[PDB]
Amino acid sequence: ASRLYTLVLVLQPQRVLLGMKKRGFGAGRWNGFGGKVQEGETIEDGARRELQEESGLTVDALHKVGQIVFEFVGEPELMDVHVFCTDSIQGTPVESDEMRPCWFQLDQIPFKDMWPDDSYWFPLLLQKKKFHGYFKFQGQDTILDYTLREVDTV
């Protein structure tokens, strides 16, 4: 019982782009660009579409960096999140009704205003490591249990 999602990080040598979400699931946190994969769509095509819809950016090369499963206790559907990175983009980030984008230096990542699991896996993403993760949540703030391991193949 799982639903496919994508999550894209625009990660350059000295900075990362994040979006402050205005509405819906994750509102009030800095997020990467992501959402549900559609019928007849590849996971990578879904990742490229979500980045354009949410940030206004066009991506060249996407790289697979991780897979994370999220459980919310009492909710039947697991989230199966496929995580990607890119450095090569075109366009300038667009502020919309849904998202306020900002660049962060890599020593100023706003973890206090991000999903709490990011403190565990974001440091692997920054050192170009690949990973498999599982996080069990109670509500949106409390991690009950987790596993996280580095892999050669996502």
Ligand X SMILES: Cc1cccc([C@@H](C)c2cnc[nH]2)c1C
Helix (DSSP H) and strand (DSSP E) numbers for the chain: 2, 11
- 103 near ligand X (CB under 6 A): no
Q: C-beta of 81: minimal distance to ligand X in Å? A: 5
Determine, following the binding rule CB under 6 A, whether residue 66 of this chain makes contact with ligand X.
no
SS3 51: helix
Closest CA to 56 of 94, 9, 11, 99: 94
- CB-based closest residue to ligand X: 115
HSE-CB of 75 using CA atoms within 13 angstroms: 14
Q: Residues 1-40 vs ligand X: string with x where CB under 6 A? A: ----x-x-----------------xx-------xx-----
51 is a contact residue toward ligand X (CB under 6 A) = no
Closest approach, Cβ 71 to ligand X, in A, equals: 10
> Any alpha helices (H) in 5-106, and if so which ranges?
43-55
75 is in an annotated binding site: no
Residue 81 contacts ligand X per CB under 6 A: yes
DSSP letter, residue 103: E
Q: Is 143 exposed, middle or buried (0-12, 13-18, 19+ CB in 10 A)?
A: middle
Q: Is 135 annotated as a binding residue?
A: no
What residue numbers does the annotated binding site for O(6)-methyl-dGMP cover? 6, 21, 31, 115-118
